[PDB]
């Protein structure tokens, strides 16, 4: 209907509660492995944020996997920063991590993050 | 870190994509039954929006159920309106459905919705 009312803070509150489920390890259904590191997450949040995870979890065989191994060139800290961004909207971008974050965002197909990284690099430059 | 940047539209974009997964029936993992009607959804979105679903899906036995039957007094249209609100932030509140929506929101433990219903009822009256 065109007659709906909207609760402004709803989407933010849902995301905060999804991140609280991740903290508490509630209903997490996949482990992402990045070299020696493991990260537990919810497949639906990953698919909602990343073109790569959308492709993986819509594949008729990979949708059933409980462990996904990323390419060994992916930096675990870069992945951790992007997983935190998926669950919070906040990106911990620093001079010391920007190249790894940008490369990880390119691989995960997260264009907005790639764009801000490119802008911060261009400004320095 | 206190040095993060934030993407304003991220939470809204995640919620829109979760609702697109629900439309496409991708990764839905529970059927909610409300009398003669069935609704497919994602347990994590339900838990993030409703105190009742948080309690159900954190219970060590009920977390494994693929079907949850609601109380027969719950109106299916009222539930449909609240499920759409969970996935979109928009509440289709109308004179013809407000009592059912309020009763359903009380049962699902969705206090903000109960509050707006009470306000709209008080204004009429």
């Amino acid at each position: 209907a065109d007659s709906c009312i909207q609760f402004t803070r709803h989407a933010s509150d849902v995301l905060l509660n999804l991140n609280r489920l991740r903290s508490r390890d509630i209903l997490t259904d996949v482990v992402i492995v990045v070299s020696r590191e493991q990260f537990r997450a919810h497949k639906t949040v990953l698919m909602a944020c990343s073109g790569l995870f959308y492709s993986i979890f819509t594949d008729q065989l990979k949708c059933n996997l409980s462990v996904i191994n990323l390419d060994p060139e992916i930096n675990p800290e870069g992945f951790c920063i992007l997983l935190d961004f998926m669950y919070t909207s906040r990106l911990n971008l620093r001079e010391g991590n920007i190249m790894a974050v940008m490369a990880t965002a390119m691989y995960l197909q997260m264009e907005h993050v790639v764009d801000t990284c490119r802008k911060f690099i261009k400004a320095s430059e | 870190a206190d040095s993060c940047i934030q993407f304003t539209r991220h939470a809204s974009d995640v919620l829109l994509n979760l609702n697109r997964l629900r439309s496409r029936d991708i990764l839905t993992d529970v059927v909610i039954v409300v009398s003669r009607e069935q609704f497919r959804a994602h347990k994590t979105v339900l838990m993030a929006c409703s105190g009742l679903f948080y309690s159900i899906f954190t219970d060590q036995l009920k977390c494994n159920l693929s079907v949850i039957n609601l109380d027969p007094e719950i109106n299916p249209e009222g539930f449909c309106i609240l499920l759409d609100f969970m996935y979109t932030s928009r509440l289709n509140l109308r004179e013809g459905n407000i009592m059912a929506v309020m009763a359903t929101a009380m049962y699902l433990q969705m206090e903000h919705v109960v509050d707006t219903c009470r306000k709209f009822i008080k204004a009429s009256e």
Partner: peptide, 5 residues
């Protein structure tokens, strides 16, 4: 909160 979207 609530608004007209």
């Amino acid at each position: 909160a609530w608004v007209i979207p």
